[PDB]
RNA sequence: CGCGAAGGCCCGCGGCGGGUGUUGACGCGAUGUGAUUUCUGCCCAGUGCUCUGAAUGUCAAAGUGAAGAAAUUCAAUGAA
RNA sequence: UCUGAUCGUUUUUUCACUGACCCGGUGAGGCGGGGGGGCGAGCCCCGAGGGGCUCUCGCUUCUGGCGCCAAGCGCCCGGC
């Protein structure tokens, strides 16, 4: 039925269409400004990060401020052709997001360390 | 000068009502077909205390006759009403306490409470803690009725507007001396927050033209017109008389 | 019907406190979109207020059976349209060079649409029929045209709808139309109309002027009037 | 043409087409704003005498101010 | 002492605005005195407040008449 | 001297209508007319067969239970 059974009148829903523009609003997709070579700035080497790299089987990196833990995993995995188990990312007082990359048991955190240049 | 206390009691501020904890309004129910020509039957589920009122309400539970659910109201509870009672509501519901029926179909002399003003406003007159409006004499032509409100003024009320029978429970409240400054405090904290009054004669002559002086004396004739501007109009307003 | 084993009737009781009321039409009670309660009561005001004769003369309209006769005649004399004015324009221009024929010729009789065109051919006493849409949007556009038609001696008739007068032509709506000339075969058919049109509109024009509408109180309000007057009766 | 007849009519004010019509104006400025679009002028001549024509791109709003 | 809600007291530059009011005279609002006990005397002239009002003394916009050529002059009528 | 009260105007007083305007209720849920039908009541005639009239009902009050998303009937049409 749906002619008159309730005492209220509501808006009768109509049809809707989606945009089919006769030109793209902007010219071309804007390439990323945040890729592998920008989200892993450089490895860190201090007296803390050296205990971390030789004992806990992890690395240490410094990472752009806007970067998930899901994003840091992909970068290091694709950069050095490595594996990552888990990542921990504090943000230092200066404002740089320090990242602790726990390394997969199948790999040797020293042998990866020599490759990336840090002693 | 500055505005006297009682001249910023309308600004809508600190002098609001304290209505955080109040259980709900107090209205009978909207007039519909089932109430106009027949009578609908409801239970008194639980009687509760509504803070800031010496007339405890009552959660009556009805049945919607054109859909399927349970509807609840907050009637002002008449006296004698107890939980698990079948309260009726309408035009053909017989006389008995706590059972609304429209003045006009109730005999001359029947005591009502929570009487409506005009048909459909769901209860306005004679609903304090233990007051009652009396019906006097119908007039089956022009469809009017005369009620004797609690003050004493006889009103020519329109008929066909409803009123729950019996006095309002909670009566005889003002017979215990409060006896304490604090016990009056706790009473006025639960309502609009305006308790401790300070006489005009005490405040310096800015507030209350009464004030000032060197003997704490009014100085001005107390009785005031009602054409007087808003700000002098203090004391015995528009006094038709005075003295004991 | 042979007896069924255990099929039950099981009726229902309807009323105050009994089983729940059914779902039936509330056509009179539904809170309408409030844009129509404007357009709805406007139908009621023009029944209540004393509508003056200059306006109320627009209710009394040409009958149906007479209307189809006229609309038949107008169907013969509609104006040219796009896409065939165009093709004749293609036929017109492309024949100019050859020398046998050329662009323009004589114009056979056609209607005339706008009130600003009709009148300008009415006070010159050139209009035979005058048809007025009975419901023009500002009714001030034709509130003066009847009294003009009578003073000039012109048969005029009022049809229902400005939209179908917009179909005798090819636009959304057309306030007015007027026959200025016809061909000799249909001239019999025209006089059959004006001999009955002007007996009801032009001839009794003085009857129309002394007429006033409105005051038709509501059925709830008028049934009470009858009942109480019956009581005195 | 009709415009002269229209012009000579609105000079003779004190009508009811003006009273039948305030109610149309006074209500629906609440169903919509006190500023809404009319689809076409309710005064054809006066709009035209003031510069309005009937072509595309022209709009006509009705606006209600309070006296005093 | 005011007030039965087209209400009392009040806010507000303004609206079918807002507070008391999710309230209704055993209530809201305005005062004065200051537990209980025992009493609360005389004055309505003065100053206020309120109550009613035809035969109405005064009484302003409109409004009505009279004279003038008109601006105007005059008169009656007259709410709080 | 009152010679209709007709179509016409206005000073008018009192009452009535509602359409302007205002208030209140609602999930804007059965408002005003007219009959179908009667457990019944009555008013009246009347061949006991019935005929005319007035009242009523969406027809429920010992129980802190349940109550919607149609049964039944009537008319079509399709698959196999």
Curated annotation (Swiss-Prot), chain A:
* Record PTM text: N-terminus is methylated by METTL11A/NTM1.
Phosphothreonine carried by residues: 8
Instruction: Tell me which UniProt keywords the record has, alphabetically.
Output: Acetylation, Citrullination, Cytoplasm, Isopeptide bond, Methylation, Nucleus, Phosphoprotein, Ribonucleoprotein, Ribosomal protein, RNA-binding, rRNA-binding, Ubl conjugation
- Which GO CC annotations does the UniProt entry carry? cytosolic ribosome; nucleus; ribosomal subunit
Which regions are flagged for Basic residues bias?
Answer: 1-30
Instruction: Indicate where this protein resides in the cell.
Output: Cytoplasm; Nucleus
Please give the residue ranges the record annotates as the region Beta-like import receptor binding (BIB) domain: 1-37
What is the residue range of the signal peptide feature? none
Instruction: Say which domain of life the source belongs to.
Output: Eukaryota
Residues bearing Citrulline are 4
Q: Which residues carry this modification: N6-acetyllysine?
A: 33
The question of whether Lyase is a record keyword is answered with no
Q: What does this protein do?
A: Component of the large ribosomal subunit. The ribosome is a large ribonucleoprotein complex responsible for the synthesis of proteins in the cell. Binds a specific region on the 26S rRNA. May promote p53/TP53 degradation possibly through the stimulation of MDM2-mediated TP53 polyubiquitination.
Q: Which family does it belong to?
A: Belongs to the universal ribosomal protein uL23 family.
UniProt note: domains: The N-terminal beta-like import receptor binding (BIB) domain mediates interaction with IPO5, IPO7, KPNB1 and TNPO1.
Q: What is this protein called?
A: Large ribosomal subunit protein uL23
Whole-protein coverage range = 38 to 156 of 156
From Swiss-Prot, chain B:
Tell me if rRNA-binding is a UniProt keyword of this record: yes
Q: Where is this cross-link: Glycyl lysine isopeptide (Lys-Gly) (interchain with G-Cter in SUMO2)?
A: 41, 148, 233
Q: Where is this region: Disordered?
A: 206-231
GO MF term list: rRNA binding; structural constituent of ribosome
Which domain of life, per UniProt? Eukaryota
GO biological process terms, alphabetically, are: cytoplasmic translation
Q: Which residues does this entry mark as bearing (3S)-3-hydroxyhistidine? A: 215
What post-translational modification does the entry describe?
A: Hydroxylated on His-215 by RIOX1. The modification is impaired by hypoxia.
Compartments annotated for it: namely: Cytoplasm
Q: What InterPro entries is this protein classified in? A: NA-bd_OB-fold, Rib_uL2_dom2, Ribosomal_uL2, Ribosomal_uL2_arc_euk, Ribosomal_uL2_C, Ribosomal_uL2_CS, Ribosomal_uL2_dom3, Ribosomal_uL2_RNA-bd_dom
Assembly, in brief, is:
Component of the large ribosomal subunit. Interacts with CRY1.
> Which PANTHER family does the entry mention?
LARGE RIBOSOMAL SUBUNIT PROTEIN UL2, RIBOSOMAL PROTEIN L2
User: Which NCBIfam families does the record match to this protein?
Assistant: PRK09612.1 (NF007180)
Instruction: Report the protein's function.
Output: Component of the large ribosomal subunit. The ribosome is a large ribonucleoprotein complex responsible for the synthesis of proteins in the cell.
The similarity comment for this entry is: Belongs to the universal ribosomal protein uL2 family.
Would you tell me the protein name for this molecule? Answer: Large ribosomal subunit protein uL2
Source organism of this protein record:
Oryctolagus cuniculus
From Swiss-Prot, chain C:
Compartments it resides in: Cytoplasm
Q: Name one GO biological process term.
A: translation
Name the InterPro entries for this protein. Answer: eL8/uL1-like, Ribosomal_eL30-like_sf, Ribosomal_eL8-like_CS, Ribosomal_eL8/eL30/eS12/Gad45, Ribosomal_eL8/Nhp2, Ribosomal_eL8_euk
Q: Where is this cross-link: Glycyl lysine isopeptide (Lys-Gly) (interchain with G-Cter in SUMO2)?
A: 23, 72, 100, 220
User: What highest taxon heads this organism's lineage?
Assistant: Eukaryota
Q: Where N6-acetyllysine occurs along the chain?
A: 9, 72, 192
Among the GO molecular function terms of this UniProt record, one is: cadherin binding
Q: Which Pfam families does the record cross-reference, listed alphabetically? A: Ribosomal_L7Ae
Keywords assigned: Acetylation, Chromosomal rearrangement, Cytoplasm, Isopeptide bond, Ribonucleoprotein, Ribosomal protein, Ubl conjugation
Example GO CC term: the record gives: nucleolus
Function of the molecule: Component of the large ribosomal subunit. The ribosome is a large ribonucleoprotein complex responsible for the synthesis of proteins in the cell.
* Cross-referenced PANTHER family: RIBOSOMAL PROTEIN L7AE FAMILY MEMBER (PTHR23105)
How is the quaternary structure described? Component of the large ribosomal subunit. Interacts with CRY1. Interacts with DICER1, AGO2, TARBP2, MOV10 and EIF6; they form a large RNA-induced silencing complex (RISC).
Give the family per the record. Answer: Belongs to the eukaryotic ribosomal protein eL8 family.
So which disease is it linked with? Chromosomal recombination involving RPL7A activates the receptor kinase domain of the TRK oncogene.
Tell me the protein's name. Answer: Large ribosomal subunit protein eL8
UniProtKB/Swiss-Prot annotation, chain D:
Which positions bear Phosphoserine? Answer: 33
Q: Which chain positions have N-myristoyl glycine-type lipid attachment?
A: 1
**Subcellular location, record wording:** Cytoplasm
| Homology family | Belongs to the eukaryotic ribosomal protein eL15 family.
The subunit structure is:
Component of the large ribosomal subunit. Interacts with IFIT1 (via TPR repeats 1-4).
Quote the function comment for this protein: Component of the large ribosomal subunit. The ribosome is a large ribonucleoprotein complex responsible for the synthesis of proteins in the cell.
* Protein name as catalogued: Large ribosomal subunit protein eL15
Source organism of this protein record: Oryctolagus cuniculus
